[PDB]
């Protein structure tokens with residue numbers, strides 16, 4: 001790996017600089033190098049890894065949606081034939097997106113998840129695994145599409161089971177996991193009722209636990225609760 | 237070149253798709269491939285080339301400024317020593333930026349400028365040459381810094397001479413050239429009075445020629461005149 | 473699109 | 478920063 005010669009601490013430092021400079025591809029490459037040092041990641045380091053790849057894949061997903069929309073319109077009745085270029089370029093972006101997802105899933109499988117014993121790390125990584133299979137599912141149309149969807153579901157489900165046993169209902173990782181699994185149900189699994197039920201129950205159980213929190217924890221938890229509410233408003 | 241096997245028209249089509257998807261690195265690579273087909277570029281194709289690289293280098297310049305600011309603060313009195321990482325990463329971004337500038341300058345020199353005979357194409361390319369030498373000058377600190385600055389000045393000056401002979405004072409290319417050369421004077425050449433004089437005279441001569449224009453040309457010209465006014469307000 | 477984190 | 482096009 002091209003980061004093999006750089007110190008772990010230097011990779012982390014540069015990931016933070018790349019974030020400040022909004023250079024998210026660099027940030028992801030630095031964090032990949034840090035993961036490949038083989039040591040477990042701290043809470044802050046996990047969040048750097050997550051931020052970097054979320055921004056990279058987020059840009060790819062946005063571009064893929066633009067191109068997919070153009071491709072769909074080109075295949076409508078009365079549309080003029082413009083050749084293979086739209087499909088080719090959509091496929092190019094799609095392949096790059098799949099490559100990023102495969103890279104993240106590879107880091108999780110070699111060997112972040114298997115060494116993650118505390119709930120805060122294990123739930124975080126399993127949520128990420130569900131997220132990146134979900135992004136693969138968004139572009140999937142082949143024979144393995146059902147298996148891709150089930151891989152996302154399985155990772156989310158294991159994360160949910162751990163989070164319900166080991167974390168309070170206001171824990172921000174637990175809340176963000178529920179938010180994303182609910183989106184999986186709505187957008188991927190054709191299960192809007194499950195999506196709505198999960199978001200509502202998560203919101204209500206968090207509400208009932210806010211009284212235990214400091215002002216700073218309350219701010220963290222209510223921020224994500226508002227995202228759950230925003231989705232409920234969109235869906236109902 | 238990796239675009240050598242793709243049709244010129246397909247490269248142009250994909251550059252437009254990349255623009256819609258905000259994939260400016262792809263857009264630039266497609267337009268580089270189109271230039272390397274060896275044919276002259278139309279007005280629309282020149283503007284695609286310009287848009288693509290302006291966005292790529294603009295992001296690099298913004299990142300370089302963030303990192304340079306951090307590096308400058310790290311070298312202030314009382315600052316804690318944090319190692320070589322800030323300088324290294326600033327140098328990494330700087331080298332990539334210089335690479336993009338060298339690529340654009342290489343396309344202009346092989347062989348866009350020498351085949352550009354009409355004022356609209358030749359002024360456009362010479363302005364770009366001044367712009368990309370200006371971006372090199374922004375990061376230059378070595379023995380060749382004066383020669384880099386003079387290369388920008390010389391390209392801008394040739395473009396100015398042609399534009400004053402061959403274009404009306406409201407021509408948007410002429411106006412944008414004057415805007416950028418004025419910025420060169422202010423930011424690069426330590427010549428704020430020349431910057432102000434050029435912006436003022438350009439604005440006033442355009443104002444006096446607006447009466448000749450259609451509504452659509454008037455909109456194009458006044459848009460750039462407002463940028464000249466904005467700089468004058470910043471500088472006075 | 474719905475919110476995710 | 479000043480405006481350029």
Ligand SMILES: *SCCCNC(=O)c1ccccc1Sc1ccccc1C#N
Nearest residue numbers: 050051054172173176177220223224477
């Ligand atoms: S991708 C960076 C991860 C940090 N924040 C998140 O996007 C995230 C991820 C999983 C679960 C929840 C959240 S939001 C969050 C996370 C940690 C602490 C506070 C908050 C909030 N609000």
Ligand SMILES: *SCCCNC(=O)c1ccccc1Sc1ccccc1C#N
Nearest residue numbers: 286287290408409412413456459460482
């Ligand atoms: S980088 C794409 C070039 C298109 N517009 C510009 O940014 C530009 C470049 C050189 C000189 C002027 C301008 S602004 C412009 C250009 C052509 C037509 C109208 C306008 C405007 N307003």
Ligand SMILES: [Mg+2]
Nearest residue numbers: 091094095139
């Ligand atoms: Mg495909």
Ligand SMILES: [Mg+2]
Nearest residue numbers: 327330331375
């Ligand atoms: Mg250097």
